[PDB]
Paper text:
The retroviral structural protein [name] forms the immature protein shell of nascent virus particles. All retroviral [name] proteins contain three canonical domains: matrix (MA), capsid (CA), consisting of independently folded N-terminal (CA-NTD) and C-terminal (CA-[name]) domains, and nucleocapsid (NC). During immature virus particle formation, these domains function in membrane binding, viral lattice self-assembly and viral genomic RNA (vgRNA) packaging, respectively. Our results show that [name]-1 uses a distinct CA-NTD arrangement to form the immature [name] lattice and that, in contrast to other retroviral structures, the CA-NTD is the key determinant of immature [name]-1 assembly.
To gain insight into the immature architecture of [name]-1, we used cryo-ET to visualize mammalian cell-derived [name]-based [name]. However, to account for the observed heterogeneity of [name]-1 [name] VLP shapes, we applied local C2 symmetry during subtomogram averaging. The resulting maps had a CA-[name] layer that was resolved to a lower resolution than the CA-NTD layer, which we predict is because of heterogeneity caused by flexibility of the CA-[name]. Three-dimensional (3D) classification focused on the CA-[name] yielded a class in which all helices were resolved. Therefore, we used both domains as independent species in a multiparticle refinement using the software M34. This approach yielded 5.9-Å and 6.2-Å resolution maps of the CA-NTD and CA-[name] layers, respectively. Within the CA-[name] layer, the only intermolecular contact is a dimerization interface formed by helix 8. Unlike other retroviruses, where the CA-[name] forms interhexameric and intrahexameric contacts, the CA-[name] of [name]-1 only forms interhexameric contacts. The positioning of the individual [name]-1 CA-[name] dimers places them out of reach of the adjacent dimers around the hexameric CA ring, not enabling them to contribute to intrahexamerization interfaces forming a lattice. The positions of individual dimers are constrained only by the flexible linker between CA-NTD and CA-[name].
Numbering used by the authors: 1 to 79
Write the structure that this text describes.
């Protein structure tokens, strides 16, 4: 059963921060005790982002950057 949080995908018109927030909440609830959240969150923030935000993140070299940088990068994107 793939972790419920691994299936969280950014919607087509969902702002990136809203998506990251849902992801963050899911990880808080679903990660076993002692599992590092931050590296998982960063990885998923990129890999589960919609195509537009993924492009922005790639273009800026933020495919594994701190979450703050990823948030700033996708802010320019408004559905």
């Amino acid at each position: 059963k793939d972790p419920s949080w691994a299936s969280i995908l950014q919607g087509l018109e969902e702002p990136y921060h809203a998506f990251v927030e849902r992801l963050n909440i899911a990880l808080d609830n679903g990660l076993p005790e002692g599992t590092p959240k931050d590296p998982i969150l960063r990885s998923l923030a990129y890999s589960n982002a919609n195509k537009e935000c993924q492009k922005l993140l790639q273009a800026r070299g933020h495919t594994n950057s701190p979450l703050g940088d990823m948030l700033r990068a996708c802010q320019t994107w408004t559905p």
